[PDB]
């Protein structure tokens, strides 16, 4: 369900490992359960630190 | 100021008195580094006097 929703925000009809990684890492309890697993071809969530940005 | 055209060509002053007019203009502006033989400084002085 979460993977299909995340695909729907990406305007795609094909579920890929990227959408699965997005669905797992964006949900707190699912991230807690699947903490120590690496999703093949899943990539990384976009995260840029606040003080890393210029002023 | 060093160009081909001349300020005094638009006046009634004869060309034989151009250095006289430039010495008047240079001495009026309280310049002291001026020398009579330096035509360039005379032209600069008269240009800054008439068109500051």
């Amino acid at each position: 369900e979460l993977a299909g929703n995340a695909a729907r925000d990406n305007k795609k009809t094909r579920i890929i490992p990227r959408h699965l990684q997005l669905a797992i890492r964006n949900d707190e309890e699912l991230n807690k359960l699947l903490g120590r697993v690496t999703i093949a071809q899943g990539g990384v969530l976009p995260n840029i630190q606040a003080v890393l940005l210029p002023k | 100021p060093q160009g081909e055209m001349d300020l005094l060509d638009s006046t009634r002053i004869h060309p034989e008195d151009y250095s006289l007019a430039r010495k008047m203009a240079a001495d009026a502006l309280d310049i002291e580094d001026i020398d009579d033989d330096d035509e360039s400084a005379m032209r600069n002085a008269i240009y800054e006097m008439v068109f500051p």
Binding site: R36, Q41, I48 | -
Partner: protein
């Protein structure tokens, strides 16, 4: 094959650091990343090799690799686990 640790080139490790959100890279860090990558690969390769040797085989398969990784708490999904 002789000293191909330099095959992990500087733009590649720069890309790997860049995915982690790192903005600036020190000039001395590359040897350290090569060393830690060598250590990790050494451990996983060792475990996969003894898994294969127990199986009386001469070719390391993906199942041994996924088994070794999962035994180190680094479970991998997508390769027949």
């Amino acid at each position: 094959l002789r000293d191909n640790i330099q095959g992990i080139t500087k733009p590649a490790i720069r890309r790997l650091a860049r995915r982690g959100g790192v903005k600036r890279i020190s000039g001395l860090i590359y040897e350290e990343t090569r060393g830690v990558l060598k250590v990790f690969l050494e451990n996983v390769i060792r475990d996969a090799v003894t898994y294969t040797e127990h199986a009386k085989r001469k070719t390391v398969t993906a199942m041994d690799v996924v088994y070794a990784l999962k035994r180190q708490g680094r479970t991998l999904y997508g390769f027949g686990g």
